[PDB]
Design a protein around this motif. Structure first.
Motif: not given
Ligand code: CL
Lengths: 134, 134
Positions: A119, A81, A16, A107
């Motif tokens: 996920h 996050k 990311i 997540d």
């Molecule tokens: Cl993500």
């Protein structure tokens, strides 16, 4: 041998933040399923990679992922996050604003044999677009 | 003496689905903090009660809270759920549509002595408003 939480931290940093798709290949399993994938998108690893290369990194520059908390039970890791980045490209129909924004996300990742297997994702897009529009 | 997962399950049924604020008083601590409270709202139990009585229940009828999974570690319980309801009131600038919509959400609750002590939320409002506009 590093932990499920450590693998998710490495994914958030190398994939990311940095956009290293070589790291993606190493950290995402070929039998990966993105349960949060929209009805039109592939829930597979290729669909998931396509979100970063085709949507996220073209839209957001200087990505900083703030991992606040990680709650783990029965091989599932919940990460709370914040994705902080500069809006430099079209994001959810919003043209580049040049604004530094903070996307709050959550997540749930299932790490198997050092790779992302399953996920689920949740993100504050309403709030992120509100930031962009201010 | 029931578990954190059982307390959250009862809160979602009696407070969110049924709107019983007598149950709220019994399940929320007076020192409670909503870490996901909007900028102008009180992070206190009063502010949190105000979200349900003032914005959620006037907007949504026949609420169904579909709890998918609960992940617990170090006194924190993550609930992955889907709020299903009929849009009968004003909801984030969208006047009543009469549509039955599904809001995907995730919350992190800290239960102390059978009551809600701390709370973080994430919900797909973007998706929910998209449903209202279809
Ligand atoms: Cl993500």
């Amino acid at each position: 041998m590093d932990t499920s939480k450590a693998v998710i931290q490495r994914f958030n940093r190398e994939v990311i933040e940095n956009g290293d798709m070589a790291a993606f290949a190493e950290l995402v399993a070929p039998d990966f399923v993105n349960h949060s994938a929209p009805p039109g998108v592939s829930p597979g690893p290729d669909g998931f990679a396509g979100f970063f290369t085709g949507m996220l990194h073209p839209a957001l520059s200087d990505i900083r992922v703030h991992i606040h908390e990680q709650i783990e039970e029965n091989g599932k890791v919940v990460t709370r996050k914040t994705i902080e980045a500069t809006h430099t490209g079209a994001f959810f129909g919003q043209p580049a604003s040049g604004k530094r924004i903070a996307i709050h996300a959550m997540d749930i990742v299932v790490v198997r044999d050092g790779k992302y297997a399953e996920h689920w994702s949740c993100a504050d897009l309403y709030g992120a677009l509100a930031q962009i529009r201010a």
